[PDB]
């Protein structure tokens, strides 16, 4: 975890893959390639209370603690690939998503170019429910 680059003239980039689901939050640091990882760490290690791991309070706290540890490793710049569950399923990030986001706003990492990358299908397989739907 040592970028030999000089600090400001140019950045040694990593790339954080921020998964924000409605029941989990991943954080997966990698190289420019992506194939090689530096540090991945999740919330579920840091907080053990099933009901409020995806809670926005939990996802924020998680994002701060995780981003803190990656900064700790000393990577100055990051590419970003925020991602949600996707597919035939939901296209909206869950309640953790946004608390994590604001948390990473205060956390301090130098940010390269951002992009969205949730895998939307052209034409999809059937959603997990009835025809009559998740009813309640």
């Amino acid at each position: 975890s040592l970028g030999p680059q000089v600090a400001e003239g140019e950045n040694v980039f990593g790339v954080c893959h921020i998964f924000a689901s409605f029941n989990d939050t991943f954080v997966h640091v990698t190289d420019l390639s992506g194939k090689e990882t530096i540090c991945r760490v999740t919330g579920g290690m840091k907080v053990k209370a099933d009901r409020d791991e995806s809670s926005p309070y939990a996802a924020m706290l998680a994002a701060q603690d995780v981003a803190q540890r990656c900064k700790e490793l000393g990577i100055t710049a990051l590419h970003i690939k925020l991602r949600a569950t996707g597919g035939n399923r939901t296209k909206t990030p869950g309640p953790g998503a946004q608390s994590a986001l604001r948390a990473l706003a205060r956390s301090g990492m130098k940010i390269g170019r951002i992009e969205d990358v949730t895998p939307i299908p052209s034409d999809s397989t059937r959603r997990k429910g009835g025809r009559r739907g998740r009813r309640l």
Binding site: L101, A105, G108, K128, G129, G130
Partner: protein, 101 residues
Amino acid sequence: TKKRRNNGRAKKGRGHVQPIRCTNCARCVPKDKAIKKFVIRNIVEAAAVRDISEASVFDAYVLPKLYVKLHYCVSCAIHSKVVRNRSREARKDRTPPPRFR
């Protein structure tokens, strides 16, 4: 009695359309009856961008956008409170309000 002229849908010349699975539920709704919303929106909305803008490196570097198109089911819509009930008379006023909100 006939409650609405179009039966809460837009089927005048056609005859059948493909069903969709709800996002909040999975309730099957005819696409033509189903509510369609094209929501494009900033991955960071307004409060966050001011905070996150502190987190950006470059002074004024544009953010990409989050191009959604949502469909909800009916009971979810009233619950999520997107649409309100209206009177028998106001019902025909099918013009949406201007662009104040």
